[PDB]
Amino acid sequence: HMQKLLSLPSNLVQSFHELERVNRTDWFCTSDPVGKKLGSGGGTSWLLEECYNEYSDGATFGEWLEKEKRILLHAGGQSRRLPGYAPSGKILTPVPVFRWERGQHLGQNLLSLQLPLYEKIMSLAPDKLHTLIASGDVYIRSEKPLQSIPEADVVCYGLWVDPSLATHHGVFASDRKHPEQLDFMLQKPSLAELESLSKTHLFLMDIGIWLLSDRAVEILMKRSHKESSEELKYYDLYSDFGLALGTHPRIEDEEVNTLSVAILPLPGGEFYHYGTSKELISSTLSVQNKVYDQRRIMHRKVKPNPAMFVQNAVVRIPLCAENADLWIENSHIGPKWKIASRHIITGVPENDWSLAVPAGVCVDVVPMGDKGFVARPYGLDDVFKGDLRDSKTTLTGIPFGEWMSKRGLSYTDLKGRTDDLQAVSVFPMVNSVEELGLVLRWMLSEPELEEGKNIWLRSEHFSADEISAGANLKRLYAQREEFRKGNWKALAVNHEKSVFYQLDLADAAEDFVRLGLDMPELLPEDALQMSRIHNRMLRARILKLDGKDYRPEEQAAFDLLRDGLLDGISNRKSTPKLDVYSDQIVWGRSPVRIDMAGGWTDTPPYSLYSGGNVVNLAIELNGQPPLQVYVKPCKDFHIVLRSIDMGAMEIVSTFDELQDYKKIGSPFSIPKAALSLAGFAPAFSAVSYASLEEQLKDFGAGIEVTLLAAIPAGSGLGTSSILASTVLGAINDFCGLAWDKNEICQRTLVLEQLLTTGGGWQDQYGGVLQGVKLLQTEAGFAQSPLVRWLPDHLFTHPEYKDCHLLYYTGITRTAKGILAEIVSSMFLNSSLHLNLLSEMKAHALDMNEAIQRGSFVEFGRLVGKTWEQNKALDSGTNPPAVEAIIDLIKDYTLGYKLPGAGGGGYLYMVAKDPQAAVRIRKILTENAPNPRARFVEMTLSDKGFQVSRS
Amino acid sequence: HMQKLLSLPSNLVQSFHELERVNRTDWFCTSDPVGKKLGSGGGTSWLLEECYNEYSDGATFGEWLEKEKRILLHAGGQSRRLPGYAPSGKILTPVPVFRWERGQHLGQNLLSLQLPLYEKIMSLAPDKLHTLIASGDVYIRSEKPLQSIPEADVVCYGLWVDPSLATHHGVFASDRKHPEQLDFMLQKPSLAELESLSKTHLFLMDIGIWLLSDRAVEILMKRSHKESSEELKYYDLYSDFGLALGTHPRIEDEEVNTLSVAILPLPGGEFYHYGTSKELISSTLSVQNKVYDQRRIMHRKVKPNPAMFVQNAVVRIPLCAENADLWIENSHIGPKWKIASRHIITGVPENDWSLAVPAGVCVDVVPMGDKGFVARPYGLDDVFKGDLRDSKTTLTGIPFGEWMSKRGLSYTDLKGRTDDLQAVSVFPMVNSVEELGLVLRWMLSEPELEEGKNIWLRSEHFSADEISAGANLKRLYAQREEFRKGNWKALAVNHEKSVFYQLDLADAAEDFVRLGLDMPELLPEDALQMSRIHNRMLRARILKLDGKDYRPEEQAAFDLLRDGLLDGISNRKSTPKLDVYSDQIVWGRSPVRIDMAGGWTDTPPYSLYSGGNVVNLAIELNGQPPLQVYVKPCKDFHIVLRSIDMGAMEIVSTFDELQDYKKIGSPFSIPKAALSLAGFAPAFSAVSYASLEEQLKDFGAGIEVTLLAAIPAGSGLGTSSILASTVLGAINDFCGLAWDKNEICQRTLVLEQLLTTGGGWQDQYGGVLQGVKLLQTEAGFAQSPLVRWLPDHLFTHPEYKDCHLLYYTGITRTAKGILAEIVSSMFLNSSLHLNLLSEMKAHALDMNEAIQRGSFVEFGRLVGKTWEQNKALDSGTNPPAVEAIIDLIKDYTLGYKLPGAGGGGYLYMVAKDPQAAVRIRKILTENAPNPRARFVEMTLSDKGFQVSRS
Ligand SMILES: Nc1nc2c(ncn2[C@@H]2O[C@H](COP(=O)(O)OP(=O)(O)OP(=O)(O)O)[C@@H](O)[C@H]2O)c(=O)[nH]1
Ligand SMILES: Nc1nc2c(ncn2[C@@H]2O[C@H](COP(=O)(O)OP(=O)(O)OP(=O)(O)O)[C@@H](O)[C@H]2O)c(=O)[nH]1
Ligand SMILES: Nc1nc2c(ncn2[C@@H]2O[C@H](COP(=O)(O)OP(=O)(O)OP(=O)(O)O)[C@@H](O)[C@H]2O)c(=O)[nH]1
Ligand SMILES: Nc1nc2c(ncn2[C@@H]2O[C@H](COP(=O)(O)OP(=O)(O)O)[C@@H](O)[C@H]2O)c(=O)[nH]1
């Protein structure tokens, strides 16, 4: 597991692992020494020092830093501009579920949303960069493939967004002749400053993702201490260390300038700050406004305003269009509340207050002590900095002097600090919800309230620093959890309009079992089919986690899926007519396929969620099409089915026998379903016939179908789907149905839905259509792949053709059918699975690009990456014997993978060059893992499915 | 030229063609009959009836409606909420140049900005839709490719919008299970209705872009008249006709429901209101802040506030950050003015007034009569509706009763109507700028000024309706033109910070010549290179339009372009070494190319503006590579050059002779430049030599280069560039320079820059690289195409191969005039040319898609569309002889085009089928247009440039 190190507030360090439910093995956290601020760089150095002192197994710091890669997040500031989550350190702020996203956790926060990108970047990083540094108050997205990470001492990711937004952050400025290096950094530059440099420089806004080598770490830790030894000091990573980097740095440092700096634009990058109260709402609104298409929005709720976000809360007042810019979290809004706009309500316990909240002021309630509450009303624009007597120092939008004067208070009532509003003990700690409401009314729009002033005088006073230092986070998290327990039922009941069935339902089931909640009730038959499948699978998972019987629920979900996929599978009528002469035989034949990338993304229901991308190609094996079908007229008015590979024969005389797909011991389900779809079953026939015998008498003869699958099913080469398509095409030619290859593949999809195989669509398109292809579908039950052919240069040119090797290993899967687990995880919107499948889609697009550009090396590498993705999706795909075979020859390949679901069988290898291919052949021949392993010659098929007549 | 029909205010109809300088053939305008409103549908029927009565020519209404597609715009309301441009009908409102856009006209208005999208949609529409309907008070953008337009009776464009905004417009509601249909429309639905329909329906905001068939037009016009007679009536297209459409319409209508409705979401659509005074500022601010890319923003100037827009105006006071929401147009702001924020100043003549404008109040001055001015002060929030005695009836932010009382006035001074503020004659018409200023001061923040009241009492009074009805728009446009004449000089001087050199400089040159302005002075050498080229070409165009000598200015612009393209002349040095045996000969050969789509988009400087997209392929002619080069060692230490096609020979003995590219009568400039780039000229040689003879003595021998261009020059098949690349590749093999094909093409670009050809990069990549390719570059001087190969199925498969016909027309022509005209238009940011080139890029992408999908019919159709685009870009591309050749066989083709710049030469035809190809051959053989015309057999080249040794 990637190690996370966090610089947290002192109060949170002791409770982080319990409140966030994370183990101490993968998570280490500490704080700045109480009473001493260290800044960004100083806090990072202190975090590194603490983690080293914790796991110092006797090695020095230098050899310890190399031992593993680490992701360090600094969230140990004061959070002046975000008081609502200052005691949580910003990084633990709950983030609403995106109305366009599937598979998110209901209790997601900024940390859990932002961590995967950091882990991906670190796994892509070179091995000499053992330290990633980031701020936890941002949400960063990358919707395009990451570029190579250079081997510099400092690697900073940047993003050009808007000069107005760049005005508030760090900016990397690079000379127009050299965007590769960093010329200098700028901390919050003005619009005029960026304009004056626009003619000669490019600017990338600093998004707070830095990567440091051991040399840069040494220099930062030397700068974070004093002149002698261990004496710590304040040091800013971005304003002191940052401005000293680049070609022409603003700050001078002999050791910092020697560090090479590399600025990387984040591909498809998006940046959303979460450091101020205004940004808390604006960034969430932007993320919501990334998608507007209602066909891609699973949250079917009409909000009065898009900038209204309610999490872990109970709202007893009606919300209207005038209540814009609203953020309610971990709060209870009583029915007698009166609100306007621009509000941030956090931590408020249950109440029936008659509280009027003016526009622009926010209310925060922090649990303090065992039973007390600290009331912090503040302003959406309050910065909490500066001297109290300055007119610019504001509280709840009002200057602090005016706030004091209007309430009949004097500065003699504030004993303590007076030069910094952050350190002014002005927030009262009450011991009752009634006193809390009274003092909040007094501190807001009722300064004449007698009892409020009395309570404020009786109560102890806390500053924002003291609040963050003494907050009882256990009670805060417990209130949030009780609110979320109520919200689970609320969302499940309101499923037709809520985000319930687009959430990660595995996480939801875990939370249901942990909180002691009952399973959601069964959705009525009138509900959405997808929602019904989600509901049944969630109930099954809850029963499994509880220790009850879940098999019927699971099977019911699968049955709802198969019923859902039926489109024109009932009313698609054909009129088969004997289109050949009496002594003619129809021969159809098809090659198999190898999927290069994007496999699994065509599998329902994920393909229904977002559409699939698959790059694959048709291949003949040992110079022959492995799937073959013969169709001929029969003197008797019945259907004869013969199987060469199974060595069997069967006579179908009635409609009932033709549609008996699950007949015990029959290997003829595929041709039976194919003949049914061709119009020899009543449901698919345009003409009504009394019996199969009468239909065949009107037809002119019976039908004799002989089938050959020269490659057994489960080999991963697409045997079953391609055989179904071959039978369909032979019957198409024999019966004059005039189907084209695309319609044959679609009828194959329908056929496999008749047989309840539950697979995707990639195999039949890969085999029936010639050449190498990219296949893409959109979201929805209607899955009809758009086909884009690719150049076959990398597979047919003499310098490449002999580098594609196919090796039958003689090994079959030792593990069980994990496919069921994968499909059920898809039904539960499992976040890990959905993320991996999305990465597989993007990787299929990258494979398509590599093939288009004619890059053989990149093609082989991406094949290897597809193998890695498949191993990550299924642990049983790579048994140890296959891994030993791989290790025998891995040094001579650009990449390799198993075709299809894998688990053994065939190994596809892309040799580096023809000599490497000869070497691979020699090695695997002289070191056969078993007597059955053998090479199989594969050639790209320029024909696909072929059919001819005698 | 698609015909535009406009329903305008009555006063504007009489002067529209003169004020906007448009011909009466392509522009028709009328108004609703004065005294009766007809609504959207009634106004549409009246506009159609008027245009028919004008251009009937003896046809019936149906056969006239069929003749052509028409774009109808309704801009004929009262414009209560936009008084500053009410007499202009909103649609003629000047709109500031987008700071991120290139090629816009300085005098652009809303009409000129909105027309291109409508014309694009209409040209994409099926031929049965002859009528597009739109409102003139909106600005709509589409930044993603438009989808196919189905063939329905009514086609409506929509946009996914927040429900809160959808509450204020028409809404198309489609069942979630059938988004292809329209279920029903809703006119301004409430939030509760959207809640009730959100669970079962999708809603798209109506953006006001409808397309109607002739039957729908007939029904709309029957509904727009009464029942018995021809008397027109009010009829709403969206509330009456719209609510009667769909599957389950809200309103019942026997004839309207039979119309098929198709709802299309606008890809990448953006909607900007232009109906109220505040929206005038807000939508403009949004459009300005729409683009973020530093590479695409040429106007890099930060004003004190982003919401300050100044057009056609002189401002004598300084503008600061507090002057937000400011719109100054066609106005002179004297130095003694005092303004705040939220202002709209229009039509103010030159003055020295001491006028104080309070925040939120706007000033408008409308020329009236021969020399008079009507002063209309109003409020930014004034709606101009309601009875005068209501407190809500507002004027300049003040209730009208209070405004009357504060100036000692009574309702006995207002003769006329009193129930509608729009019809109250309260605005005085004065006869002098002095009286104008006095009465404006009186009507604003100086109600106690007696002289203002006296002038108001003596002067005639106009209502807003009377202003819009009697306004002297000629004087308004003349004042605007004088202001713009001043602004031209102001912008040209301030070129480093203005939008000057990103404007349409052809329009700018025309305006400079018309207004009698001198050309801008020469930019210093320290200015931006692109800006300097723009400056020189603009001076050249102004001199040419004036009748002076412009050739040196043009040549200087071309030289600045060539110098800008000079890149690696220093950091790409070669060391040629004799790499062949003494008796060995190197033979290089290349096929020609046919560009399928995107030609011209690779030509600088447009390729530098936005990058090029070109789909092209290599072809052999009559089974041979038409470009051939032989290189062999020479006993003498000189260079021998022989030309087979020119039948010539030349001896190069010195560096001076080798670099004499423009030698009189020499056809050897290409091989001389190629040998120079290979390292036989000192500037490109890594080793310094005293003379060419010494370099060749160290080399081991001289060089003998024989060239053959088997296809005559000017054929359009890429002969020159591909021959240059062939020489470069032959010399590369002969000298062991180890260049790859990409480097060969880049050296070809450098060679053509040495020879000052001024072309693009498409030809060399099309010829050197095998197969069919999409080539793409980004913006910037560095033009290095990314190459993506396409499947060659549509060109090599037997059912397609014989449909590609190449016919030498027997016409030759130096296509350098077409090149010069188009390149000079590119230098001037000619709006027509830039728009057409953008469409050519998009069309290249569509061609790439069609080839990927294997669609032969779509491929041929897109070839035809490429021919149409080329004809539209240059009128000289299709001479009448080529057009006559085309007309002989056009009925047997899916498409056709001339390769390259055209002007004659070869005709590429995509026959519908092999029989059609036989027919085309027969027709063109039996009817040869000239003794030289002949068919040439073309075959796709799977080799590209090849080189071998004897
Ligand atoms: N360990 C530690 N980290 C800090 C300290 N100050 C700031 N940081 C971190 O450095 C990053 C950048 O600083 P800021 O965004 O200004 O931190 P902040 O909490 O917003 O500070 P203020 O709002 O000014 O109170 C933040 O993510 C903080 O987590 C500090 O004193 N100690
Ligand atoms: N943590 C978290 N809680 C949420 C989120 N969305 C909603 N909630 C909580 O769940 C409760 C129920 O949500 P819904 O079923 O959508 O109800 P609502 O739309 O918020 O309001 P009503 O239906 O009118 O009661 C809300 O009151 C919120 O407190 C979310 O994205 N994240
Ligand atoms: N031909 C015609 N066009 C109209 C009519 N009414 C409105 N329009 C046009 O349709 C467009 C949309 O209507 P509105 O924006 O509400 O028209 P308007 O002139 O702004 O009306 P007010 O601002 O309320 O005075 C406007 O640009 C008008 O020019 C009409 O009765 N006949
Ligand atoms: N029509 C039109 N006029 C403009 C535009 N931008 C500027 N102008 C006018 O041109 C004059 C020159 O403006 P500019 O060179 O940018 O100077 P600046 O605006 O003071 O910085 C201004 O006084 C404006 O009145 C525009 O986009 N359209």
Residue numbers in the entry:
A (entry chain A), B (entry chain B): 0 to 949
Task: Recite the paper's sentences.
The bifunctional l-fucokinase/GDP-β-l-fucose pyrophosphorylase (FKP) from Bacteroides fragilis catalyzes the conversion from l-fucose to GDP-β-l-fucose. The full-length FKP (FKP-FL, 949 amino acids) exists as a tetramer in solution, but the individually prepared N-terminal domain (FKP-NTD corresponding to the sequence 1–496, also containing a SUMO tag) and C-terminal domain (FKP-CTD, the sequence 519–949) form a monomer and a dimer, respectively. FKP-NTD has a single α/β domain and a β-helix-containing domain, whereas FKP-CTD folds into two α/β domains and the linker comprises three α-helices.
Meanwhile, a new monoclinic crystal form that contained the intact FKP-FL was obtained under a different condition. It required the presence of GTP, which would bind to and stabilize the N-terminal pyrophosphorylase part, in the crystallization solution. Using the FKP-NTD structure as the second search model, the complete crystal structure of FKP-FL was then determined also by molecular replacement, to a resolution of 2.3 Å. All missing loops in the structures of FKP-CTD and FKP-NTD, as well as the linker, were seen in both protomers, including an additional α-helix (816–827) in FKP-CTD. The linker turned out to contain three α-helices. Two GTP molecules were found in the FKP-NTD region of one protomer. The other protomer had one GTP and one GDP. The first GTP corresponds to the nucleotide substrate of the pyrophosphorylase. The second GTP (or GDP) binds to the same site for Hepes in SUMO-FKP-NTD.
